[PDB]
Motif scaffolding. Structure first.
Motif, mmCIF file in Angstrom:
data_model
loop_
_atom_site.group_PDB
_atom_site.id
_atom_site.type_symbol
_atom_site.label_atom_id
_atom_site.label_comp_id
_atom_site.label_asym_id
_atom_site.label_seq_id
_atom_site.Cartn_x
_atom_site.Cartn_y
_atom_site.Cartn_z
ATOM 1 N N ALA A 110 0.827 -1.193 0.000
ATOM 2 C CA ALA A 110 0.000 0.000 0.000
ATOM 3 C C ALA A 110 0.868 1.253 0.000
ATOM 4 O O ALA A 110 0.636 2.168 -0.772
ATOM 5 C CB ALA A 110 -0.968 -0.036 1.169
ATOM 6 N N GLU B 230 0.744 4.137 -2.789
ATOM 7 C CA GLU B 230 0.190 5.421 -2.334
ATOM 8 C C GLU B 230 1.199 6.559 -2.445
ATOM 9 O O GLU B 230 0.847 7.671 -2.866
ATOM 10 C CB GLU B 230 -0.254 5.310 -0.881
ATOM 11 C CG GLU B 230 -1.494 4.459 -0.689
ATOM 12 C CD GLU B 230 -2.784 4.959 -1.279
ATOM 13 O OE1 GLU B 230 -2.798 6.012 -1.892
ATOM 14 O OE2 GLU B 230 -3.790 4.199 -1.116
ATOM 15 N N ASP C 196 -4.891 13.982 0.444
ATOM 16 C CA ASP C 196 -4.262 12.799 1.019
ATOM 17 C C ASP C 196 -2.820 13.132 1.409
ATOM 18 O O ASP C 196 -2.105 13.747 0.618
ATOM 19 C CB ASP C 196 -4.244 11.651 0.031
ATOM 20 C CG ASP C 196 -5.590 11.123 -0.432
ATOM 21 O OD1 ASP C 196 -6.578 11.408 0.231
ATOM 22 O OD2 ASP C 196 -5.610 10.427 -1.459
ATOM 23 N N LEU D 233 0.891 6.683 3.629
ATOM 24 C CA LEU D 233 -0.331 5.939 3.370
ATOM 25 C C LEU D 233 -1.482 6.813 2.892
ATOM 26 O O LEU D 233 -2.628 6.364 2.760
ATOM 27 C CB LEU D 233 -0.699 5.108 4.596
ATOM 28 C CG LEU D 233 0.166 3.850 4.802
ATOM 29 C CD1 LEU D 233 -0.102 3.303 6.197
ATOM 30 C CD2 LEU D 233 -0.085 2.782 3.782
ATOM 31 N N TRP E 110 -8.196 2.003 1.490
ATOM 32 C CA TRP E 110 -7.160 2.433 0.558
ATOM 33 C C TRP E 110 -7.512 1.882 -0.810
ATOM 34 O O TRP E 110 -7.264 0.717 -1.084
ATOM 35 C CB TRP E 110 -5.756 2.011 1.014
ATOM 36 C CG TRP E 110 -5.251 2.691 2.243
ATOM 37 C CD1 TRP E 110 -4.591 3.886 2.267
ATOM 38 C CD2 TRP E 110 -5.389 2.275 3.613
ATOM 39 N NE1 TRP E 110 -4.267 4.205 3.545
ATOM 40 C CE2 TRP E 110 -4.803 3.276 4.413
ATOM 41 C CE3 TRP E 110 -6.006 1.185 4.252
ATOM 42 C CZ2 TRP E 110 -4.724 3.168 5.781
ATOM 43 C CZ3 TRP E 110 -5.969 1.093 5.617
ATOM 44 C CH2 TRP E 110 -5.327 2.089 6.368
ATOM 45 N N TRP F 106 -4.685 0.083 -2.432
ATOM 46 C CA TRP F 106 -4.521 -1.279 -1.948
ATOM 47 C C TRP F 106 -5.507 -2.210 -2.662
ATOM 48 O O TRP F 106 -5.136 -3.284 -3.130
ATOM 49 C CB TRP F 106 -4.647 -1.373 -0.418
ATOM 50 C CG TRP F 106 -4.545 -2.806 0.052
ATOM 51 C CD1 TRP F 106 -3.415 -3.481 0.379
ATOM 52 C CD2 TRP F 106 -5.633 -3.721 0.264
ATOM 53 N NE1 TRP F 106 -3.699 -4.783 0.712
ATOM 54 C CE2 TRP F 106 -5.054 -4.953 0.661
ATOM 55 C CE3 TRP F 106 -7.019 -3.617 0.165
ATOM 56 C CZ2 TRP F 106 -5.828 -6.061 0.989
ATOM 57 C CZ3 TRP F 106 -7.787 -4.709 0.520
ATOM 58 C CH2 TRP F 106 -7.193 -5.914 0.892
#
Length: 129
Positions: A31, A35, A52, A56, A108, A111
């Motif tokens: 992830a 990300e 964001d 992460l 996520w 993910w």
């Protein structure tokens, strides 16, 4: 800070992410790769006006305060800037809340689209852990 792959794996493990909510360490490393490319200073603006933040890519709509996301919450009780630190404590602590929220790591989208169902253990292959 731009972490190395195994460097970040080690730090995530030390901060208790390995098997947190049932997600092996490779899931978290994967992830972070997609990300942020392992960069704690990554930021990305969303079409909805939220942003964001960090390794992460934790969103200001629910989890942190950045002062410019109308109608949003701050459920991790942190300024979003804390998620950009070289110290991943705030990002980890906040991720533990996110992944506990009901949908696991599907919170996520990266993910779900790039890690889920894949051989995530490869992300920790070779690392001293």
């Amino acid at each position: 800070k731009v972490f190395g792959r195994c460097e970040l794996a080690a730090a995530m493990k030390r901060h208790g992410l390995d098997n947190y909510r049932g997600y092996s360490l490779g899931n978290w490393v994967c992830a972070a790769k997609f990300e942020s490319n392992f960069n704690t200073q990554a930021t990305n603006r969303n079409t909805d006006g939220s942003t964001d933040y960090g390794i992460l890519q934790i969103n200001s709509r629910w989890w942190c305060n950045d002062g410019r996301t109308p109608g949003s919450r701050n459920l991790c009780n942190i300024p979003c800037s804390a998620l950009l630190s070289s110290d991943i404590t705030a990002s980890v602590n906040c991720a533990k809340k996110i992944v506990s929220d009901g949908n696991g790591m599907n919170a996520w989208v990266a993910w779900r689209n790039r890690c889920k169902g894949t051989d995530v253990q490869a992300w920790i292959r070779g690392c001293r852990l």
